Amino acid sequence: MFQFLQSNQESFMNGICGIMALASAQMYSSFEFSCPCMPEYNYTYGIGLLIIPPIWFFLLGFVLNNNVSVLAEEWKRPTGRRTKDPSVLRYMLCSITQRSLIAPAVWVSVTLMDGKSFLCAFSINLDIEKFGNASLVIGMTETEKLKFLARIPCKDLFEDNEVRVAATRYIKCISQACGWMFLLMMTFTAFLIRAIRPCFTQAAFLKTKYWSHYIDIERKMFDETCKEHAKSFAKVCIHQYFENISGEMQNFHR
Amino acid sequence: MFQFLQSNQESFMNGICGIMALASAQMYSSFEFSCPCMPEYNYTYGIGLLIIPPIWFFLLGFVLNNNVSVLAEEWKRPTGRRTKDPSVLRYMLCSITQRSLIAPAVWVSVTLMDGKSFLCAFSINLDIEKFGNASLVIGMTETEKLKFLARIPCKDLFEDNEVRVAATRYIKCISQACGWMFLLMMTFTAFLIRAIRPCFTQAAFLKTKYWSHYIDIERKMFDETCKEHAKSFAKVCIHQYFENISGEMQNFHR
Amino acid sequence: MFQFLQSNQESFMNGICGIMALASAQMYSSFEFSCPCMPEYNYTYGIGLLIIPPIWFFLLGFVLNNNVSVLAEEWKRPTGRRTKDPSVLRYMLCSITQRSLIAPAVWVSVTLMDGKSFLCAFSINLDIEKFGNASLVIGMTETEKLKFLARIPCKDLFEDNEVRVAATRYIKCISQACGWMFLLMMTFTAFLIRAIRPCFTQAAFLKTKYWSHYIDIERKMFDETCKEHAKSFAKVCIHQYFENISGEMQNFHR
Amino acid sequence: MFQFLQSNQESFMNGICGIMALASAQMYSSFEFSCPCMPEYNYTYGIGLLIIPPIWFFLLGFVLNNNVSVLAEEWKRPTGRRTKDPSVLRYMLCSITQRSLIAPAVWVSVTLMDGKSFLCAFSINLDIEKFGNASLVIGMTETEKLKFLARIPCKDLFEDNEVRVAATRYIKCISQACGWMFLLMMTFTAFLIRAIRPCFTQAAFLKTKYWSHYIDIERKMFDETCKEHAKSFAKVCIHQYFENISGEMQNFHR
Amino acid sequence: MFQFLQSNQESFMNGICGIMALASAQMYSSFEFSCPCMPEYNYTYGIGLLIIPPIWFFLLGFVLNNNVSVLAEEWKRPTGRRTKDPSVLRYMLCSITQRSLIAPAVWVSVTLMDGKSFLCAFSINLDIEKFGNASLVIGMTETEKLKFLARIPCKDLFEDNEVRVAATRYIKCISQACGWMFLLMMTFTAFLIRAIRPCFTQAAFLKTKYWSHYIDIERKMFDETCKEHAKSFAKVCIHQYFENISGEMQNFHR
Amino acid sequence: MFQFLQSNQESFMNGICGIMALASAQMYSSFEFSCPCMPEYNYTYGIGLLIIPPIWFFLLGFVLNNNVSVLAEEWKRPTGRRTKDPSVLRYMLCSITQRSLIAPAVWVSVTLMDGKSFLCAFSINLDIEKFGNASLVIGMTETEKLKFLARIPCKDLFEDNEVRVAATRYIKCISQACGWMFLLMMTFTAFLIRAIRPCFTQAAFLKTKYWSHYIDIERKMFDETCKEHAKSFAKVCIHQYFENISGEMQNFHR
Amino acid sequence: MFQFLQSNQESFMNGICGIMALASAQMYSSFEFSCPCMPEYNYTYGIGLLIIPPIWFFLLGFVLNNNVSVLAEEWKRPTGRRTKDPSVLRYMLCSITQRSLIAPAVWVSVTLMDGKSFLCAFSINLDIEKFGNASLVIGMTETEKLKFLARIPCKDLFEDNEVRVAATRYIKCISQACGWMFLLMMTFTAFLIRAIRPCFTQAAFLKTKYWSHYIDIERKMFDETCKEHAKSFAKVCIHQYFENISGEMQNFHR
Amino acid sequence: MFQFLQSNQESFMNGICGIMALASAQMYSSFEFSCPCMPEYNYTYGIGLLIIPPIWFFLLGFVLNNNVSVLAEEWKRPTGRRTKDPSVLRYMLCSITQRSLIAPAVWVSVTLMDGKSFLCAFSINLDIEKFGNASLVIGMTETEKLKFLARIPCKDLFEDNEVRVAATRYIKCISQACGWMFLLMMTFTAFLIRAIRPCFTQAAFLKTKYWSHYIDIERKMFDETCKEHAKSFAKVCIHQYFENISGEMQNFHR
């Protein structure tokens, strides 16, 4: 689902959040899921791939946002020295935080729709009599059937394909149900935020918008002012260089 | 069917509704249908994939529409304070709702034409003597033949390929019949709305159109006014910075 | 046959009719034909896929045409109040109807050239002694040979491949003959309409052309007039906002 | 052979004839040849695919040409009322007819070079002792060997692959010989027409060229004249609408 | 070897000759060589595909050249009436003929480098004791070994793959030798023509160049003169039409 | 993940660092990992591919940066002669160093997520009783089981596929855990640097920015000044050349 | 190696020589090498493909160069009549010859690096005891082992794959060694020509450059002068044509 | 790794060196490595492919550089006649030499990372008891085991796949270690040259830059001066030609 905003870089309302949501789901495709298939490590691997990459995509939204240093500058300065109201600083932080949650939400949704994190984390929690022969886990210890159930996420380590296919379909169904409930709760949260909060936080929104435009203007105008103060002194140095070297370029190029 | 409006971004009359209908059907292709193949869970999985993603695509149409906060602002304000007639607010809500139903309708139609939601939900409702051997479901309990019929949507869990192919073709035929009746009822509803309602709701349409143009003008004009009020104060700060630092850039760059 | 008008969006004389004929044939390719292979349902499935999608493509031509609401407005108004002659309204309706029949005609032609609708609908009408062994349908009941002949459209439900290939080639030949006779009658109808009718309905054609140009002008001029009446009042509101907030932006950004 | 004029839309001298010749040969590729492989129907199928689609491509050249209605208008009008000489009308009809024969000629040539129409139509006319065993058609009736020879165009209905390959190569050779003689006669006819006729029909060519330019000018100038007469009356209606509604937009947007 | 002048339409000195040489070799690739593999017909098929398509590509160069009608006009007119010198007419004919020989030469060269025309035409002329077993053509009649050697161009009609591969490599070697000698003689002929003839036919070259530029100027200037004489009379007719119909458009659109 | 900044060369804030991070990960894909599968060399190969290419990508960032020669010029010059403050030189070096660490960090992350460097380096550290038969490493010497465990990274040198797949999944899990902890520590380091340091090193940042703009201005202005001093002397030499040679070009070209 | 100058048509210093070197190596790829695998013909086929196509690419460089007719004109004219010095004519011929040797050198290099011409020409010169069994060529005549060794370039005519692979690798190694020595001698020749000769042939280079610019100017200025002398006389003829025909177009188009 | 500078022809600082490094690595991919697999020739083939193509890419950098003739002109001229200082000539030669070493360094690095040159050159230096059975090279002569070890680079000449895979991985590891040490030494050499030498050779750099700009200006200004001196004399010749021929074009084109 990449060609849509790729061929339409106009449907955005912020650009870096659409790129990072695209990058979050493409990084899920490129990641090679390697469940340990051991009963000690399956839970932390499967749940860690649902928890740790969203934390990293969230921090990466703060690192890539170029207003977090200016906001950290204002919060470090003492009260009275601060040129901003505390509601404008709180609104600014809330704006950065809400755009930094898109790529974590994209990761959690592709992970739950794919079903592999639940298959790795919850295959030792199965009740295997619902899936095939009952004569599988008889004759085993409690320890040995935990090792048996832990190998269900691995095709080339689990030999009974019928029990593996039935247990994989059952867990991927529950994972897709959690993925649709996650999408539905986060979109209904997005609906209440985009309907109730602009009825409540107004003119902090207008001060934060003037603050954001002032930063982009101040950065650009400082760049072209440095360039015109360079062109004054660089013209002085270049012309003074050729005062002497063209005295040599007389005999050297004529 | 994606290259048509992809190479022709002129045949639209709204852009976000054509993108979301494209995204709805592409998300159906990317979704990996995983029927549980258990008689307790097949119905809720198959009917839930026909009900829950249309609800989510409907809410996503409200979240992506940038006039729902302005409409929620007007409805929250008391009567007398409201600058709008109640017919203009009702017409505005009806406009957002009708464009938010395109991507749900695209989902329901691709789901019924594909046939997998009916195959998952209705395979325990089959009468299997119409499809193959009669000696399949003899010798089974009522419980055991419900488990037998529940595995029909799964190729690698159902062994009799002739009975599976015959039952799959029968249910996919009924699903395609419901998909064509759904398309035909929703297009005939679209015909009656686009023929009778502009004979009845006129000049609310013209007030809602002026309201929509006024919002896009007010947002843009506020953006460029913030930028020109930034350029005044940013020019002051940059010039005052180089008053002192060019006093240092004397010895530092000459 | 899609790249031709795709790379040449100049050979048209109307754009939406070329897109919908392209979309009609691409939707035939994307549709997965699933004959029930049951003698009760084969006829209605095969003939329903030849009848019902053309009705839907015809209604979709009325829904996508933006002059059907203006025409419905004029017909609803009483005689005397109507600003148009009844011949101009009849000519207008005939213009919309003739362009709405292109995508139904494209569907019927690809369906008859493919041959699957006739194979599904007419395989129980076969005389199977023309195709293979005569010892197939002996020893069967009349009911059982109807079930035998109904499975001919299904490769994985019909076991005698020689009889299936011979019966499929016979019916696809007759379907292609009906497809060429359908194309030839509809093109000869198109020839008589585009030769005799502009000798008979003239100056209703010129009034309907002025009517169509007047609609596109009135819609566009209403859009830019709403935008310039927005820019007056939006400039008032934005300037009055910064009268007070720049009084705060004194201490807040200097 | 499509990328040539596709990437060079300058080598034309008429555009619709190059597109329809491209469309004629692409429609041959998309058509799935389905010989009946029955001795009653093979001739009419094979010769019908050589005769009927050229008739349809010829009529389609008349339907797509936008001067056939203006020519039909002039021929319907009585003598004396006709503003044109009869030689200009005859030259005009000959011009449309000659461009409408390109796509029929492309169809006949790809059909004869492919060889399938001759293979279907003429396989019961074979003398099968030239191709393999002589012991094939002994022990058969005259009726049964006609059914045997009719299945030669069908790989999956004819079992002796050596006799089938030899008979297919013999008939495809004769079909390619007829295809090269057809191309050579039609190109030599094109040479005599483009060398002798502009020595004989001159200044009817110049009157027909002025007639064709006059039509394209009259259609375009009528379109922009309708648009400027629309813009007069549409400006009146829009300005009169906002006389009253801006009286409401006082309190409604200030 | 198509992308070179496809991506560089500047390396030409005439455009239609580069397109037809490209089309000649692409038509060789698209042509399905079907040797009869019969000793009566192999020679005429193999040598006919080396002779007949070059004659057709040569005539097609005369048909596509738009100066052959103007040259045929001048030659038909009597001496004294002719406005041209006979050397200018002879030079003009020689110019058209030399550009019309490029696509025949491309056909002959791809046909000889591919080797199939010599393999078909000359396989009954082989001496098969140079290629495999000597015990192949003993026990055969002179008639039967001619049928045996005629099937060498056909993989699926000749069973001894070692003798077929050895005889195919021998004949394709001789065909490639004739193809390189053909290329070398035609390029050395092209060298002598482009070196000796512009030393001999000069100022007929300059009169023929002025003649060619005069034709392209006269055709274009006649086209725009017809269009400006159309715009005079079309403006008269359109304005006179709206004199009466705007008298009706008073009540009809106000 | 290459098409994102490839189709969007605007989301950058420096260009060479985005290219080198892209080149670092593409060089990982192109590198063919060839573990020695010997217990003496596996550790240094696997850990060397995690250490040595980041050192090389770090040095390559210094070589490709065009300000390291100007900074080396300033540091070589004695104190008092230096036109820059030591804080501006330290800030400049820190700026080059931080951008030169992106491609090393990309290499370490793709190497740990792929898992092959840990599989090569740590397969002799395994405890193989956790993975398959216990009867594998009995009957072996301590030397021989080190050779046995060293061949685990090699599919075609290790025969027990079940033990190899289980040991590969265990080590790739630990490698992906180290890769996520590495990404999380380096992004949290990037967060603290981009939040705390612009609160501490300011106006060295502004002097280093003026220094960087001054270099790009001085290089460009020296280039165009050399070109205009060339055009003076080149015009002299060319005109003086044709003073004599046009005296020869009189008789030579007239 | 085609996309480089294909996407960069700026790195050239002549265009036709880069195209012909590209065409020389692409023609090597398209050529199907067909060694006769006979001891009488292998040498002349293998060495002929190394000699004859370079001669043809050399002549093709003279045919495509548009200055060889002007140079042949000057050499044909007698001494005294010649407007050029003999050193300028010799320099001009040397310039055309050196650019015409690029495509021959590209052919020889791809042919020696591929190794097939040496494999065909030199396989009867092998000493086959270095490559496999010694019992191969015992029991054979001197004539029969020449036929045995001649079939080494043919995979499907030589049965011992180990001896064939060893002999092919040995000869392709020697061919690649000759290809690298050929590249190294021709590049060192190119170095001495581009270093010593512009120290020796100067101002013949400047006269030949003025001669080449004079030809391109004289051809273009003759083309536009013919076009403006056409536009004078074509305007006369077109206006005089419509003097009479607009007398008819009075009644014919009003 | 080609699309990077292919889609970004701006990241360069010289263009021909980036193209030749791209061409060096693409020529490595296109080269078919053919180890002789003979103990006399393996070393010179494997080490020759590491030595000889870098020498050729180095000379090709001198041939393609258009300043080596101007530098050779200055060095040939006697002292006193030389218009340049000897430090400017030495700096110029060092500039050409350093850019001509990029494509040799790219070749050596891809050759060492691929590992085939070390596999060919060093497989007779192996100690084969480290890799498989010890019973391989017993029963062989010293001569015969050299022939046995020489066939390790050839898959289809070495039969023990386990010993071949183990020996190939060992040598490719050592080759990749030498490739990383080569990259690291050449990049650290590039670091010391780009840091220490612009602190030492300055104003020879500025004279060599003015020299390079003067050459590009003098070549271009000589080209346009030849063209304007052509246009003077070509206008004279063309106008004088039509003085006489338009006297003939009176009767010939009127």
Curated annotation (Swiss-Prot), chains A, B, C, D, E, F, G, H:
**Topological domain ranges for the Extracellular compartment:** 31-42, 119-171
Q: Which residues cross the membrane?
A: 15-30, 43-65, 93-118, 172-197
Q: Where is the lipid attached (S-palmitoyl cysteine)?
A: C94, C199
Q: List the disulfide bonds.
A: C35-C120, C37-C154
Listed GO CC annotations: basolateral plasma membrane; endoplasmic reticulum membrane; plasma membrane
Where is it localised?
Cell membrane; Endoplasmic reticulum membrane; Basolateral cell membrane
Region annotation (Phospholipid-binding) maps to 56-63, 98-110, 183-193
In residue numbers, the region (Central pore) covers 3-30
Q: Which segments sit on the Cytoplasmic face? A: 1-14, 66-92
Q: Which family does it belong to?
A: Belongs to the CALHM family.
What does the function comment of this entry state? Pore-forming subunit of a voltage-gated ion channel. Has poor ion selectivity and forms a wide pore that mediates permeation of small ions including Ca(2+), Na(+), K(+) and Cl(-), as well as larger ions such as ATP(4-).
- The molecule here is called Calcium homeostasis modulator 1
Recorded name of the encoding gene: CALHM1
Parent-record interval covered: 7 to 260 of 351
